């Protein structure tokens, strides 16, 4: 692979893979979404569609599960979440390829994070924004993609933020198919894990400590066979925090949180963290143009493996 | 020469009227095409019959081969082709 | 299995899931690939429970499992339909078909593949008001 | 006239083609059935399978319609009809390529002719032996083709023929799906056309006259679309009688019989008569060592053609 230059007229905010790794959707502040495809010939990225989605900066994007179709969901500063289903009959690079499904204009504040649930929960979607409440949108009938019902409206804050311009929200789902449903909320300076009990409603399970500044990213780790789970949080202060989550079977399981590691190696501000599919290597991108990879050592302590510079 | 009779007849025999002799000729030629293992030519004959049965309004008059798939939906236990 | 699905390794994932000791790994609906059909002549559902009962009794009274290979959904027990015929060769069709979607016609792999690639045709072999291209 | 040796140790009795014409099945007095195939590359008749079928001389075999599979019936003098289905997952020339389906033990007499019905009537069958009884067997169970139920049981002859007198029985169906179900049945010297009535039972519909001696072969001409049905008959006389049948109590439609032509060219016994695909060529074999081909020129009257000596 080689780096490719986008057609974006401003900063690219959130970039999210599809399931198969052959498509890249880049949402940007210029009111545009550009979906790329990985051609088998010549091994270079070619643009597939580029259309205007919102009336402001799109700050989050997520692909749906491949069994439900080619669905992306975009959250922006227009207090809306708009879904897009790909129509393959239209020509590429035309602007009419991706058709809007539904607009979930229910947040009084600008929405910061959108995340799809794991595929074994059904087509379930999450929203977090400036209003300060977590919204869950389910398609109880996945037959029609235009019928979205709000199924959970949980207040993640004691009070809404007065300083609306200085805030940042993030969400991360738990990909464990057979553990109970867990969702991570990083509202302003906390981090709360939410579980679904027998009541069918979200409850506070555990709180990640520390986090002296705003949380710019959160990422649950896919634990393939491990007896613990990892949560990576990037902060405005610049500290990577990796939390060792242990689960033992009203909630059906109690969670204990142990701060496994803390890393302030980004001399500045951390904007994104993301695990790989093993849950072993963790990426971390800062405002200095540097990307660091963290792998756990022989002890229970992560260390930096490489630094990627974009000179 | 039932072959030439059938290919001449299918231009206007189901489209404008209906008679049993043309049906006999069509069935006989289709059976002979099956017996010579010319299945592709039999299928071309069938699509030519279906193309030439279009009236001025557009309604088909050919006795096309009926449906063989009636999938039962798993969510509602009902026929998807009614 | 999700990691195997992320690559284009689906037969390997099928091999892994076929002999998995845990029965509820992917999906909880059981048979998600089951295709039940209604009869093309009488309209009742093709379940063929009488034939399955008779063949199970015959295989219990005998000592072979090849009698149960006579069970299939290509025939109807309610209306005594004999067999399903291929849309190209008009031969009996028992073990693998190839459904043409807009018109609902069966066919072998070889017959359908020959008609749609070797002859470069675009319509159904049975004759249908439309194009079932490629 | 290229010859190929079939490999039987005794007299080859019945040779029949299939629907597609690329397979022949030969039965003989060595109690064997041999199926031969015609390769498109070698262009020579090669053996596909040979297996022992009956305990007596097999004298009549017939292929089923290819829409019901690969089924070969077989009539022999041991009063049985055996049905043979082919499983393609077996080796050629091994004896296990054709699997037995059923034994029809209802016949109290050595069977002479078996003909499958046309495909539009179902998977039916016909039997005729030296007891005067015409038996029809249907495969009414679609799950397994091993339960063949007897449907019709007529009595062509009043009493069975004696032990020391020769007898011949031939069968011929009507291959027309636009006419009621008919069956040309030959007794010793009587030729009967049957019909399926409204009550579901076979009835005597017409009788072909003449036939001063034994009838060796009956062949219904294939319905190409003409308004008249043709029946060819080879007799123990030198007569090749061609009957013109035109169709218009408890029968769907009455039908008349007119003797179109009668030829004495063989000066012997016409052992077999057969038609083409279109019913335009009549092949007759007699005791003069000659096989004569017959065609209709300038009128409906049949005239002779190429004579093939052997
Ligand atoms: Zn039925
Ligand atoms: Zn076929
Ligand atoms: Zn069709």
UniProtKB/Swiss-Prot annotation, chain A:
Lipid bilayer topology: Peripheral membrane protein
Quaternary structure annotation from Swiss-Prot or TrEMBL: Component of the nuclear pore complex (NPC). NPC constitutes the exclusive means of nucleocytoplasmic transport. NPCs allow the passive diffusion of ions and small molecules and the active, nuclear transport receptor-mediated bidirectional transport of macromolecules such as proteins, RNAs, ribonucleoparticles (RNPs), and ribosomal subunits across the nuclear envelope. Due to its 8-fold rotational symmetry, all subunits are present with 8 copies or multiples thereof.
Taxonomy of the source species: Eukaryota, Fungi, Dikarya, Ascomycota, Saccharomycotina
Keywords: Membrane, mRNA transport, Nuclear pore complex, Nucleus, Phosphoprotein, Protein transport, Repeat, Translocation, Transport, Vacuole, WD repeat
WD repeat boundaries on the chain: 7-46, 53-94, 106-147, 153-192, 210-249, 265-304
Keyword Magnesium: no
Record organism: Saccharomyces cerevisiae (strain ATCC 204508 / S288c)
GO molecular function: structural constituent of nuclear pore
Biological process, per Gene Ontology: cellular response to amino acid starvation; mRNA transport; nucleocytoplasmic transport; positive regulation of TORC1 signaling; protein transport; regulation of TORC1 signaling
Note: Present with 952 molecules/cell in log phase SD medium.
PROSITE patterns per record: WD_REPEATS_2 (PS50082), WD_REPEATS_REGION (PS50294)
Record protein name field: Nucleoporin SEH1
UniProtKB/Swiss-Prot annotation, chain B:
Assembly and interaction partners: Component of the SEA complex composed of at least IML1/SEA1, RTC1/SEA2, MTC5/SEA3, NPR2, NPR3, SEA4, SEC13 and SEH1.
Job description of the protein: Component of the SEA complex which coats the vacuolar membrane and is involved in intracellular trafficking, autophagy, response to nitrogen starvation, and amino acid biogenesis.
Note: Present with 184 molecules/cell in log phase SD medium.
UniProt organism field: Saccharomyces cerevisiae (strain ATCC 204508 / S288c) (Baker's yeast)
Subcellular location, record wording: Cytoplasm; Vacuole membrane
Region of the whole protein represented: 809 to 890 of 1038
Family: Belongs to the WD repeat mio family.
Gene that encodes it: SEA4
Name the record gives this protein: SEH-associated protein 4
Superkingdom in the source lineage: Eukaryota
Curated annotation (Swiss-Prot), chain C:
Compartments reported by the entry: Vacuole membrane
Position of the signal peptide: none
The WD repeat ranges on this chain: 9-48
Residues in RING-type zinc fingers: 86-128
Gene null: resulting phenotype: Leads to short telomeres.
Complex formation: Component of the SEA complex composed of at least IML1/SEA1, RTC1/SEA2, MTC5/SEA3, NPR2, NPR3, SEA4, SEC13 and SEH1. Interacts with ribosomes.
Family to which the UniProt record says this protein belongs: Belongs to the WD repeat RTC1 family.
Remaining remarks: Present with 606 molecules/cell in log phase SD medium.
Function of the molecule: Component of the SEA complex which coats the vacuolar membrane and is involved in intracellular trafficking, autophagy, response to nitrogen starvation, and amino acid biogenesis. May be involved in a process influencing telomere capping.
Name of the protein in question: Restriction of telomere capping protein 1
Taxonomic lineage: Eukaryota, Fungi, Dikarya, Ascomycota, Saccharomycotina
Swiss-Prot record, chain D:
A GO molecular-function descriptor: structural constituent of nuclear pore
PROSITE patterns given in the database record: WD_REPEATS_2 (PS50082), WD_REPEATS_REGION (PS50294)
Cellular component per GO, a single term: vacuolar membrane
Keywords: Membrane, mRNA transport, Nuclear pore complex, Nucleus, Phosphoprotein, Protein transport, Repeat, Translocation, Transport, Vacuole, WD repeat
Pfam family, one: WD40
Claim: Membrane is one of the keywords in the record: yes
Compartments where found: Nucleus, Nuclear pore complex; Nucleus membrane; Vacuole membrane
Parts forming coiled coils: none
Subunit structure: Component of the nuclear pore complex (NPC). NPC constitutes the exclusive means of nucleocytoplasmic transport. NPCs allow the passive diffusion of ions and small molecules and the active, nuclear transport receptor-mediated bidirectional transport of macromolecules such as proteins, RNAs, ribonucleoparticles (RNPs), and ribosomal subunits across the nuclear envelope. Due to its 8-fold rotational symmetry, all subunits are present with 8 copies or multiples thereof.
Recorded family membership: Belongs to the WD repeat SEC13 family.
Protein name: Nucleoporin SEH1
Organism annotation: Saccharomyces cerevisiae (strain ATCC 204508 / S288c) (Baker's yeast)
